Structures are given as structure tokens and as C-alpha cells.
Amino acid sequence: SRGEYVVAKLDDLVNWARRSSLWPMTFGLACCAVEMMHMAAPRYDMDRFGVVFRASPRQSDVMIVAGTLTNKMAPALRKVYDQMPEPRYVVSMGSCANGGGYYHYSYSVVRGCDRIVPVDIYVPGCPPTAEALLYGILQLQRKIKREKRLRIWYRR
Amino acid sequence: AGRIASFLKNAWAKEPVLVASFAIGGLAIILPSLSPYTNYAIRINRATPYNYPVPLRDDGNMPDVPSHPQDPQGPSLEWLKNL
Amino acid sequence: PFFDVQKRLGLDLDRWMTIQSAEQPHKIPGRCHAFEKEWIECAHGIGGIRAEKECKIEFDDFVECLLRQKTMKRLSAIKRQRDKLIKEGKYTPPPHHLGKEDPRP
Amino acid sequence: MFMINILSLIIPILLAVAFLTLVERKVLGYMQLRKGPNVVGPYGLLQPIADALKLFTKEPLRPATSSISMFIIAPILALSLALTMWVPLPMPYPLINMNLGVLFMLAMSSLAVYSILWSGWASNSKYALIGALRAVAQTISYEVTLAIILLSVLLMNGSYTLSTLITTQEHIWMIFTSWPLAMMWFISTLAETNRAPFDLTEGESELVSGFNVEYAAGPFAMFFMAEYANIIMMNAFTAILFLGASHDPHTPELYTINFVLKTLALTITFLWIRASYPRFRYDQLMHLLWKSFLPLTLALCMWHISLPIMTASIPPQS
Amino acid sequence: MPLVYMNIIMAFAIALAGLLMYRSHLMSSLLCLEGMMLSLFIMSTLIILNTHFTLANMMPIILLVFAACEAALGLSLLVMVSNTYGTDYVQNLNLLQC
Amino acid sequence: TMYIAFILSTIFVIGFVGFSSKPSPIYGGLGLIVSGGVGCGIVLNFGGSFLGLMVFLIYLGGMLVVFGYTTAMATEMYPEVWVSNKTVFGAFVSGLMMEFCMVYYALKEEEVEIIFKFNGLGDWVIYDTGDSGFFSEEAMGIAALYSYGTWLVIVTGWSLLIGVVVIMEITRGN
Amino acid sequence: MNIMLTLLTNVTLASLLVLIAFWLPQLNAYSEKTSPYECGFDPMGSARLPFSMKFFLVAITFLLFDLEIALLLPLPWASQTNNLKTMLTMALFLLILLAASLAYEWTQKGLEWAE
Amino acid sequence: MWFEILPGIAVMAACLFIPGMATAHIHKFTNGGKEKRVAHFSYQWNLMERDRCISGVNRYHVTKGLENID
Amino acid sequence: LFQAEKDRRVLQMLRENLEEEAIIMKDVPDWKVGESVFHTTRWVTPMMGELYGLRTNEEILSATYGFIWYT
Ligand SMILES: CCCCCCCCCCCCCCCCCC(=O)OC[C@H](COP(=O)([O-])OCC[N+](C)(C)C)OC(=O)CCCCCCCCCCCCCCCCC
Ligand SMILES: CCCCCCCCCCCCCCCCCC(=O)OC[C@H](COP(=O)([O-])OCC[N+](C)(C)C)OC(=O)CCCCCCCCCCCCCCCCC
Ligand SMILES: CCCCCCCCCCCCCCCCCC(=O)OC[C@H](COP(=O)([O-])OCC[N+](C)(C)C)OC(=O)CCCCCCCCCCCCCCCCC
Ligand SMILES: CCCCCCCCCCCCCCCCC[C@@H](O)O[C@H](CO[C@H](O)CCCCCCCCCCCCCCC)COP(=O)(O)OCC[N+](C)(C)C
Ligand SMILES: CCCCCCCCCCCCCCCCC[C@@H](O)O[C@H](CO[C@H](O)CCCCCCCCCCCCCCC)COP(=O)(O)OCC[N+](C)(C)C
Ligand SMILES: CCCCCCCC/C=C/CCCCCCCC(=O)OC[C@H](COP(=O)(O)OCCN)OC(=O)CCCCCCC/C=C/CCCCCCCC
Ligand SMILES: CCCCCCCC/C=C/CCCCCCCC(=O)OC[C@H](COP(=O)(O)OCCN)OC(=O)CCCCCCC/C=C/CCCCCCCC
Ligand SMILES: CCCCCCCC/C=C\CCCCCCCC(=O)OC[C@H](COP(=O)(O)OCCN)OC(=O)CCCCCCC/C=C/CCCCCCCC
Ligand code: SF4
């Protein structure tokens, strides 16, 4: 159909820009944040993929929860996630952000950032290598490609 | 001149920007009064014909006022042509 | 009150800017240079009282040149009469006023 | 036809802004031993398009405490003045041949100062307020220095017309004539355009995006476009003012090519400086111009007043 | 007299009325004071340009110079008042009584 | 005709009405900047390009300092806008209605105010037919500040130097 | 005419871009989304409180120096006069007075920010 | 290598060529194949108006000469 | 030459305006056609409206703003 074809091509166009223009928030906790820095380093340059760090959550599309989320920090992480405008995606990195990590049975650690914010991608490791995080970012990009928002709207 | 030389040496080591600024200002104030081309600039500005050269009525006793632009009488810009 | 230092010393501090008929750069004339010259020459050396009483014609011409009140009144009256005439179709503007002519170079 | 001319001036400028974004990314990458965008398209040529589409398809938000009337006006003013700065530039024929082709630039720059001020104040945020006051101080400093420097350089020219600048620079270059004023003018243009080392209003390390902290999606992209358009426009102004290209009336394409090459060289120098140097501190910037540039600028202004008079080389009025 | 002069004189009158009617801020009264001289500048240059008073074109520049001198004076007094009282309110300038 | 200068004069008066109603120093500065730009346009139409651009630049520079001073010394918890306060809105509406009455009456008939007499006709008609050549009369008159006007330069420079000394002395404190 | 037309064109393009930005994408705004940003925690006070200006004197001096540059701008036309000696003398007089003002302020520490 | 920066610079240069070349072409097109007349002063504006009047087609760029005087 | 052409054009426009005024103001009770405003008989330059008063808006606008608006 003409309408279905138009909405499919338009959805592919929209998903391409979001897929190829990821702007993660400058946000790191604990040891896992160093692997983000090595990913940004020349060896595994994230900028060549369209992945550019931005400081303001308003101008950010992806939150990389990289490191341990504590009880004293959870309100701030939730606040910045809320202040980040839609569409927004979440990549948790490392065992601490995935589940509890080395500090699962701790009185002051949140056993998983998904108790606070909806997580789109989980990157396993302690810390995951820069290659592993780059693979996670590419997997997030492929996940973005499969979104069909205009196709859902047209058939709604 | 030793005290002046010491002051200049210290200022050059401490405030070269101020030393250069004061030297440039002093040159800008002193030099125009000595250059022989200031009068040339004055004459060039005077020789620019912004408005029309209204002619004068000839009463028969104007030997130095030309009757035609190409007559020998009148101002000459030969000095300006080769400059 | 008015210590005429300029006239006592032969100086010239603001008399150049006092009037628009004075020496202007590049001999640029004022809008009402002739009218101001006539009024000034009429009023020179007779005092304020006599200047107001007797040079009133020159002063009125100067003010008319400056402000253009009577001229604008005449133009407005002509415009109103023409508009009234063309409202009823009595007056047909000529082609040289309607834009169908070849003006002078 | 004039509307077609306006569109031909506008749209290629925005395209050049987007590809300047790409060029800065790649230049910084290769100066930092990276590659820069090379995945989105062939050599990353579709990266600006992807970023623009993402920004204009993302949701913009208005802060709860923000003054919405001035929140919306600021990007409009910034982009409008960034596009308006390009109308009197001769390449080699200006779109609008203003008799005073420089005072218009100064006035429009001073008006474009208020875009960041109103965006920061309307945001009703502390970092935005700090960025706004940094903008105030920076504007003070670079405004006075730019005014005096431009006065001197155009005093060497004869009038405030950029085509007259071309005619003046027909034989040699204002860079040769007045290189100290040229260096100080380059620093002043950096400060005016808020580029490193003077990116104080949007200092990422010290403030979280500065005045545009609350701006997202389309309105933020408008600030970015205005910034890059101002960068290119000021580099073009510097190229016209100090690096005068030869003009052939019958084939004016050569002047356009030379002008574009000089503008690109100056813009790449801007990116080079940003990569090379750290960031200033705004009080140190204020003390840099007032205590170092301003005295030497006054001295050079006196020198350039006296020089044509003492050498009988006063330029023609027309 | 054309209507442009009418509008400029009306603008000056509005600015003068604004100065004479304070609300809370000394800064707003300073802004009204700056508007009066803006209207004066516009009126003076409109009169001078129309009548081709060539040597009078330097008067508006001097007008602007002394306008901003007055603005500087007002800002200095305002910063002193603010340092004294914590706010630029004109209600705090009541120690002296007529 | 096109009434361009008249429309700009109306906008000038509107901006004056705004910053005289005085909502807050921020919006007063905004209105003053608008008024300065529109006055620059008016005098550009009348002939003085240098004077228009000069006044616009001067007021753009002046309102920059006023913004910094109102952020520091003339701000409150809830800054007032025109519709925020009853008095500000009342003054703004009163000014707008007075300007509307003046313009409407002047357009309908030759309005003779209690102060001055204004004639309803063309600002284009009030102009002059004569013209200069190869120089701007405004530019030459302004540049005559140095050839002529030696006294004005002296008094202005002394006034500026004394102003610097004065602002140093007033804010000394203690 | 042309300048008004191009100003209108630029303003219209900017306004159209704003309209596209604020009406094309999907909007989902709640209280926490639009809250002020203070690096993840709630602001302690209000951003509308007075914010100290440590360079207040420099701003006033900037006003006066803006007047100075306004006076100095018509110099290129002033160099075309016959009275070159008088023009040069008065221009240097103005510049020397500006330099003296700067020197006085610098020596009396008007350029130093408040502590 | 470093030469992969060139295509972006080339595209930016091509984009910057368009304004000046387009303005020159439009000036030539709308002024009868000649440069747009520059009237910085009332004298030059009066020259343009006289050119419009003498042309007889209300276009200043239409120039008449000896064949027009005789 | 330009001075002579300007004089002839000004006089011609004045005469055309005078003839049109005579045609229009033919029923006004008290109205003298071509009456001067100034007391003096000295020649006075028509301001802008004595020449381009009864003419088309295009010509009026060109005469009054053509130079300033030309860019
Ligand atoms: C009816 C229109 C209303 C418009 C309202 C908004 C704009 C107000 C300003 C006036 C209109 C624009 C300028 C018209 C100029 C007309 C004369 C002309 O064309 O001159 C040719 C001249 C040509 O230059 P010239 O004067 O050097 O040369 C003379 C002409 N020749 C070349 C023949 C010798 O144009 C200029 O000089 C350009 C000057 C531009 C000045 C712009 C001022 C206004 C800027 C914005 C003000 C508002 C800021 C708001 C901030 C945000 C608020 C929320
Ligand atoms: C370099 C350019 C710079 C400037 C760029 C300016 C923007 C350009 C954007 C172009 C593409 C836009 C595509 C639509 C984007 C929709 C965004 C959105 O929120 O979608 C989700 C929404 C989802 O709606 P929904 O129905 O699911 O909403 C319910 C949502 N919940 C449940 C969360 C409450 O989709 C829509 O609303 C439908 C939008 C339909 C399309 C609208 C018009 C687009 C026209 C584009 C040009 C078409 C050209 C002709 C066809 C060509 C075909 C090859
Ligand atoms: C050409 C002029 C344009 C003016 C501005 C119009 C808005 C669009 C601006 C350009 C960008 C377009 C982007 C793509 C499309 C999205 C925007 C759009 O079209 O939104 C339409 C809006 C969209 O609604 P929305 O709120 O869902 O918009 C978001 C859209 N998506 C989902 C894609 C993110 O739809 C309508 O307005 C439909 C109703 C039309 C009729 C009512 C209009 C409002 C009320 C006015 C009348 C009130 C009184 C009623 C009685 C009258 C008689 C007395
Ligand atoms: C002004 C209004 C907005 C303008 C928008 C239109 C102008 C831009 C047109 C679109 C820009 C180019 C889009 C196509 C990009 C092709 C790049 C290519 O590499 O993508 C491939 C194909 O692209 C996408 O897969 C298909 C979607 C993009 C094209 C959508 C169809 C055309 C939509 C309509 C275009 C014209 C717009 C008309 C309406 C405005 C697959 O890439 P991908 O797999 O991910 O990368 C994996 C990583 N690799 C490379 C290392 C392996
Ligand atoms: C303490 C209370 C009293 C203080 C008094 C202080 C007075 C300050 C000193 C100034 C006094 C007057 C100086 C001269 C003013 C201008 C006089 C001018 O008219 O003279 C001209 C000569 O000009 C001068 O020679 C130029 C240099 C004058 C000196 C300038 C630098 C020195 C200024 C000192 C000021 C010090 C600051 C104030 C200290 C309090 C020639 O006369 P003029 O008929 O028109 O020539 C026609 C030119 N036209 C055709 C273009 C019109
Ligand atoms: C137009 C194209 C040319 C562009 C030029 C670009 C140059 C290369 C790029 C450099 C990177 C620029 C980014 C760096 C910004 C900071 C620059 C900077 O710091 O310079 C300021 C620095 C002062 O800072 P500090 O030393 O820390 O403080 C001094 C404390 N007492 O120096 C300056 O002030 C520069 C001003 C002097 C330069 C002018 C040279 C003067 C030489 C005078 C001789 C010529 C006299 C003229 C004629 C005399 C009669 C014949
Ligand atoms: C010249 C203007 C003043 C005229 C007389 C007015 C007197 C009353 C008004 C006073 C305001 C004038 C203030 C300006 C001078 C005061 C500045 C001052 O006190 O110090 C000057 C300052 C001190 O530096 P330091 O002591 O080393 O700093 C130590 C820091 N730890 O040094 C200076 O002299 C700088 C002054 C530079 C410009 C001075 C202007 C006067 C120069 C005139 C030269 C031209 C004369 C013309 C003759 C032409 C001959 C052909
Ligand atoms: C001419 C051919 C011969 C060439 C050689 C001639 C060169 C010599 C000419 C005279 C040199 C002048 C030397 C005076 C400069 C030194 C003064 C000095 O050192 O002041 C110290 C002190 C150090 O600064 P600080 O604030 O303490 O830094 C922070 C420290 N923590 O500086 C000051 O206090 C400021 C002094 C006043 C500044 C004046 C600047 C404004 C005037 C310059 C504008 C241009 C010159 C004006 C016209 C000059 C001619 C009248
Ligand atoms: S998962 Fe491991 S490397 Fe990452 S933050 Fe936890 S302890 Fe550190």
C-alpha cells in the first residue's frame, strides 16, 4: 500500500538518524567508567560511530549506567534520567549496574539499576572491555533499527 | 643616564607590552611634526574637487585667472602627477 | 550672567555652530540659508524689540521654510478637493500624472 | 530574483555550517590520533544530516520555572542574526551593498550578544545564569577591543565599505600592512565567537553546557547553527579585511574561490586552536584585553592615525 | 509639523511620565531616564537631518556622550544604595525628611 | 508613501510605553533595545545612517551593563512582567490606548494638540528635492567635529575623564 | 526594502524551524522531566536571587569607553579635511585622554575584581 | 589517513562557492549582462534615474548612445 | 548639463501641477491658483510635494526613498 510504504520508508529514515547519532550523557560511576574513557580513546574511537558525549541530560539520548549505583546516589540517577528527554535509552555496564556485582549483599548498594530506570541493554563484565562496551553500543543501535513507531501509528 | 637605562631594562623585562605601547604612542605624536609629507597630504586633500568650481565674472583685470581650463593660468597638479 | 569672554578675546568657540548660514564644511548650504540670511541681515543691530516688530515678514518666511505649515495646508486642501472630485468622477487625472508619459532626463 | 538571491545566500550557509560540524569533528579526531566520523556515510559525510534529523525529531522541553516568551525568542534571534550577518559580505558582490558595511556588522553582533543572555536568564537555572554573566564580561572586553581595532584597520582603508576594502587590498595585504592589529583582531574574533580558549559561556568542564543547559532538540540545534555560522562569518570577515584577493570584473569566480579558500583556512585555524589550547578564566580574559590589548590598541590607533598624514597617503574618501 | 515629530514628542512625554512615577526599583527609573535621552537624540537628529544643518550633526553624538555619563553616575549611586540597604528600592531612601 | 516612518514611530512609542510601564528591568531593557533599533530605522529612512547605527550600537552596549546590574542588584524572587501586575498592565494599556487615540485622531483629521499643531500629510512630502554629490552630508558634518568643534572635543574629553574619576570615587565606599 | 525583506526572511525561517521543532516530535512531559537542572539534586535556593557582580566598576568604565569609541569612529572621514593639523591634534588629544583614564583606573585598582 | 578530512572540506567549500557565484550571476542577469550599478551617493543615484528616463523602457541598464542622438 | 536638465524638469513639473490645480480648484469660493506662500518673490525650491504631489505612488516612492533603499 502507498501509506504503508510511505510510513515504512519514513520510519527507516527516522530510525537511521537516531541509530547513527547517539549522544550519551557524560555520566560515570566507579571503575566501569574508565572503560568508557578507553572506548573514547583513539584505539576504539566512539566518535567515528556517531557516539558523542554531552554533559547536559537535556542534550543526551543514552544514559550509560557504568559503575555501582548506591542508595545515596539512586535519587540523583533517577532525576537525571527523568530530565533526559525522549527518546532515551539506557545501557547498564558491569556487574554492579547489571545486578549487585561484588557488592550485591550490601546495605548501601542498589542490586541493579533496573530497579530505578528501565534498562535497554546489559553489558556483562567487571569491567567489560572497551570492545565489549562498543559491542553493546552497536547492539543498541541494531535494537533502534527494529523500532517501528510510524508503522505502529499507521496500523493503530 | 644609568638610572634611566636601569628603569628601561626593568620595564622591558616586566612590561614589554606597556613599553611597546608607550614607544608607539610617542612615535605617533612626534613624527608627524617632522615629516615633510604632511604638507603634501594637506595639498592633496585641498586639491580634491568635491564641489563645482563656480566661475568668476571677468571684469578685464584678472590676468592670473584663466579663461579656459587648459590655459597656463591657474593651479597645476604636475607635482601630484609624479608622486 | 553672560560674561562675553569670546567677544572680549576675539575667540570663536560656538558662534560657528550658532546658525546654519555660517561657514559649513564643503560649502554645503542649509535648507533655509537664504531665508535665515535675510532675517539675520534685517535684524542685525536694531535690538530684539525692533527686530521682532519690523523683521516679522522675514521671520515668518524663515519659519515657513523651516516647518512648511502653510505649504502642507495648501497641498492637503488640493488633495482633498481632488479626492472629492474623483469620488464623483468629475475629475479625470491626465496621463502624465497617471504614469503614461515620458519625463525629462 | 532577489528572493532567489536570499535563498542562495541562506541555504548553502546552513549546509556549510553542518559540514563544518563534520570537518571540526574529523580535524580534532586526527589531531588527537583518532579518525572522527567515518561510518555514517562515505568518510562520514552523512553525519551532519543524521545529527540534524535526530535533533529535530527529538522532543524539546520547556522548564517549569522558565520564562517561555524569552525562552523561545533567544534561538530565533541567534539564528536570524547569524544569517543576517552574511548579507553585506562581498564575494565579490555583496547581496546588500551598504555604504556603512562595518557598523552594521558591529551593531548586529552586539544585538546577537543578547541571544545567549536571554536564553540563560529565561532558563531560570543557576548554570545558565553563570553562563549569562560570563557572556556579559566577555562581551564587554571583546567589544571595546574590536571597536578600536576595526576603527584603526578601516582608517587605513578610507571608508567602511568592504568593496572598498577589496580595492584597497588590490595590490598588497592588510596582514602585511598591520599584522599586530591583525593578531589582536584574530584573538578578538575568537572571543566574540566564544571559541576556545574563550568558550566560557558554554564551558563544559566548569558548567553543564552553560547557558544552553535547559535547551534540547531543535532549539539547541539553532544555537549550534548560529554559533557555527558566526564562526564562518567572522573568519570570512577577517579574510576580507586582512587577506585581500585579486578581483577580475569579467571573471569574478576567481575572487570567490580565493575568498572561500582563505575563509576555510581561517576556520581550520579556529579548530586547530581549539584542539591545541586549554581554556581561559573569564577574569583572566578581561585582564587580557583591558590590560594588554587595550593599551597597545590605543597606541596602534594613534600610530595609524598619524601614519597616512605623515606619509601623504590618506586614502580616497570615495 | 508632520506626525513623526508628534510620535517622538509623545515618546519623550511617556518616558518623562515614567520617570516621575516610581514603583519599587531605582533601576527602572534609570531605564526611564535613558529613554528620555534616546527620544531627545531621535528628535534632534530628525530635525537636523531634515533642515540640512550640516555642522549640527555632531550635536547628537555629544548628547549620547553625556547621556551615558549620566547613566554611569546613576549606576554608581545605585550600586552604593544596593550595598547600603540590600535592595535598590527607593523606599529605603527615606532617612532624610522634608 | 507606504507610511514606513510613521509605522516605525508607532513602534517606537509602543516600546516606550512598555519600558515606562516598567514591569522589570529585564523587560525594560528589552523594550529599550527595541525602541533603539526602531529609532535607528527611523533615522535611516530620514537620512542619517551613521547616526542610526551609532545610537543602536551605543544602546546595545549600554543595556548590556544594565542586564548585569539587574541580575545583581535589581532582581526579586518573582520578576514582574506586564500581565503579572495590575499596575504595570494598567499603565501599559493606558499608554497603548492613548497612542491609539492620538494616531486615530491625527489620521482622521488634522489634530491640533493642546501643546503643538500637527498636520496630517506625508513625511515624504516634508522632505527636500535638492541633493548633494559624492559625499554624505551627515558624514561630513560629523567628521567636522575635529576640524571645527575643537571646543566640543575638549569639553567632551574632560567630561569623560572626570566621569571615570567620579565613578572611581563614588564606589570607593568606606 | 531589501534589508527589511531579508530580515523578514531570516526571522521567518527561524520561526518556522522553532515551529517544526515544537510540533513534529512526540511530547511526553511530566513534573520531573521539566524540573530545573542542578546536577541531579534539587536546587537549594532560587535562581532569581541576587547574583553578585564582582566587575561592576569595569562595566561602568566600559560604558564610558563605548562613548569613547563612538567619538573615535568618524575618524576616516575626518582625515579628508584640509585642517589636518587640527584634526590630528584633536584625535591625539582624545586618544591621550582615553589612555590617561585607563592609566588612572589601573593605578587606582579599578580593574581589580572585588574579593 | 589525514586526507579523509578533505571530502568534508571539499563539500563545505562547494557550499561556500554557491552564494558569491549565485549573487554574481543574478547581478549580471538582472542588469543586462553587466555589473550591478553601484550608487553610493546621490549623484550616482541621479545618474541611474536619468539612465532610466532616457532609455524609454524604464530600465537603467538599457544604454543608448550616438545612434540615439542621431 | 545635469543642472540645465534639472531646472527644465522642475519647471515643467511645476507647470503641470499648476495647470492641474487650476483645473481642480475651479469651484472653490476663495482660491487663487498658483499663489505663493512666502511674502518674497524670490525663487524657492519645491520641497517634495510641490513636484510629486499629484503623481503616482510609484513615482512618489521612487523620488522620496529610491536612493536610500537602493542596495
Ligand atoms: C514596518 C516595518 C517594521 C519593522 C519592525 C522591526 C524592525 C525595526 C527597525 C526598522 C526596520 C528595518 C530597517 C529599515 C531600513 C530602511 C532604510 C534602508 O533600507 O536603508 C538602506 C541602508 C543602506 O545602507 P546605508 O544607509 O549605509 O547606505 C545608504 C544607501 N546607499 C547604499 C545607496 C548609499 O541599510 C542599512 O544601512 C542597514 C541598516 C539595518 C539596521 C537594522 C536595525 C534594526 C535591527 C533590529 C531591531 C529590533 C531588535 C529586536 C531584538 C529582539 C526583541 C524581542
Ligand atoms: C537536515 C534537516 C534539518 C531539519 C529537519 C526537520 C525535521 C525533518 C523530519 C523528517 C521526517 C519526519 C518523520 C516523522 C517523525 C515522527 C516523530 C514521532 O513522534 O513519531 C512517533 C509518533 C507516534 O504516534 P503514536 O500514534 O504512536 O502516539 C501514541 C504514543 N504514546 C503511546 C507514547 C502516547 O508518530 C506519529 O505521530 C505519526 C507521524 C506521521 C508523520 C508526520 C509527518 C511527517 C512528514 C515527513 C516528510 C514526508 C515526505 C513525503 C513522504 C516521503 C516518503 C519517502
Ligand atoms: C502553514 C501554517 C502553520 C501554522 C502552525 C501549524 C502547526 C504546524 C507547524 C509546522 C510543523 C508541522 C510538523 C508536522 C505536523 C505536526 C504538527 C501539526 O500539524 O499538528 C496538528 C495537530 C497535531 O496535534 P498534536 O497535539 O497531537 O501534535 C503532535 C503531533 N505528533 C503526534 C505528530 C507529534 O492536530 C490538529 O491541530 C488537529 C485539529 C485541527 C483543528 C483544530 C486546531 C486547533 C484549534 C483551533 C481552533 C479553535 C476554535 C475552534 C472553533 C473554530 C470556529 C469558531
Ligand atoms: C530537510 C528535511 C530533512 C531532510 C531529510 C532527507 C535528506 C537526507 C536523506 C537521507 C540521508 C541518508 C539516509 C540513507 C543512509 C545510507 C547509509 C548506509 O550506510 O545505510 C545503509 C542503509 O540505510 C538504512 O539501513 C536504511 C534507512 C535509511 C534510508 C531510509 C529510506 C529513504 C527515506 C527517505 C529519504 C528521502 C527523504 C524524503 C522525505 C523527506 C545501512 O547502514 P547500517 O546498517 O545502519 O550501518 C551498519 C554499520 N556498517 C556500515 C559498518 C555495516
Ligand atoms: C579652572 C577653571 C578654568 C579652566 C579653563 C580651562 C580651559 C581649557 C583650555 C582650552 C582653552 C581654549 C583652547 C582653544 C579652543 C579652540 C580655539 C580655536 O578656535 O582656535 C583655533 C586654533 O585651534 C587650536 O590651535 C588647536 C589646538 C588647541 C589646543 C588643543 C589641545 C590642548 C587642550 C587643553 C585642554 C586641557 C583640559 C582642560 C583643563 C582644565 C583657531 O581659531 P578658529 O577661528 O576657530 O580657526 C578656524 C578653523 N575653522 C575654519 C575650521 C573653523
Ligand atoms: C589575521 C590572521 C593572523 C592570525 C594570527 C594568529 C596567531 C597564531 C595563533 C595563536 C593562537 C591564539 C590563541 C591564544 C590566545 C591568547 C594569546 C595571548 O596570550 O597573547 C597575549 C599576550 C599577553 O599575555 P601575557 O603574556 O600572559 O600577559 C602579560 C603580563 N605582563 O601578548 C599580547 O598581549 C599580544 C599583543 C602583542 C602582539 C603585537 C606585537 C607587538 C609588536 C610591536 C612591534 C610593531 C610596532 C608597530 C609599528 C611601530 C612603528 C614602526
Ligand atoms: C593628561 C590628562 C590629565 C590632565 C591633567 C588633569 C589633572 C587632574 C585630573 C587627574 C586625572 C588624570 C589621571 C591620569 C594620570 C594619573 C595616573 C597616575 O597617577 O599614574 C600614572 C602612571 C603611573 O604608573 P606606575 O606608577 O609605574 O604604576 C605603579 C603600579 N604599582 O604612569 C603614567 O604616566 C601613565 C600615563 C599615560 C598617559 C598620560 C597622558 C599624558 C601624556 C601627555 C603626552 C602628550 C603631550 C602632548 C605634547 C605634544 C608635543 C609635540
Ligand atoms: C622611540 C624610539 C626609542 C624606542 C625606545 C623607547 C621605549 C621607552 C618609551 C617609554 C617606556 C614606558 C615604560 C613604562 C611602562 C612600565 C610601567 C610599569 O611597569 O607599571 C607597573 C604596573 C604593573 O602592572 P600590575 O597591575 O601591577 O600587574 C599585576 C602584577 N601582579 O603597571 C601599571 O600599574 C599600569 C600603568 C599605567 C598603564 C598605562 C596604559 C595606558 C597607556 C598606554 C596607551 C598607549 C600610550 C598612550 C600614549 C603614549 C604617549 C603619551
Ligand atoms: S562491575 Fe566491577 S569494574 Fe564495574 S563498577 Fe563494579 S566492581 Fe567496578
mmCIF file of C-alpha atoms in Angstrom, chain A residues 57-58 72 76 79-80 82-86 88, chain G residues 28 30 32-37 39-42:
data_model
loop_
_atom_site.group_PDB
_atom_site.id
_atom_site.type_symbol
_atom_site.label_atom_id
_atom_site.label_comp_id
_atom_site.label_asym_id
_atom_site.label_seq_id
_atom_site.Cartn_x
_atom_site.Cartn_y
_atom_site.Cartn_z
ATOM 1 C CA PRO A 57 20.960 15.419 30.196
ATOM 2 C CA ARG A 58 18.656 17.520 28.007
ATOM 3 C CA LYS A 72 22.662 7.632 48.297
ATOM 4 C CA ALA A 76 20.221 11.624 41.506
ATOM 5 C CA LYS A 79 16.480 12.641 38.474
ATOM 6 C CA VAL A 80 18.932 12.947 35.585
ATOM 7 C CA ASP A 82 13.867 11.902 34.106
ATOM 8 C CA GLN A 83 15.385 15.203 32.980
ATOM 9 C CA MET A 84 16.754 13.449 29.889
ATOM 10 C CA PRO A 85 14.104 13.925 27.166
ATOM 11 C CA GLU A 86 12.607 11.220 24.985
ATOM 12 C CA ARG A 88 16.043 7.951 25.644
ATOM 13 C CA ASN G 28 5.709 13.299 26.922
ATOM 14 C CA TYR G 30 5.792 15.320 33.400
ATOM 15 C CA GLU G 32 10.288 15.647 36.862
ATOM 16 C CA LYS G 33 11.068 16.000 33.146
ATOM 17 C CA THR G 34 10.661 19.793 33.201
ATOM 18 C CA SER G 35 12.250 20.374 36.616
ATOM 19 C CA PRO G 36 15.289 22.669 36.874
ATOM 20 C CA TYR G 37 18.687 21.027 36.467
ATOM 21 C CA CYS G 39 23.365 18.093 38.501
ATOM 22 C CA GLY G 40 20.845 15.540 39.767
ATOM 23 C CA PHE G 41 19.795 17.129 43.069
ATOM 24 C CA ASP G 42 17.105 19.683 43.802
#
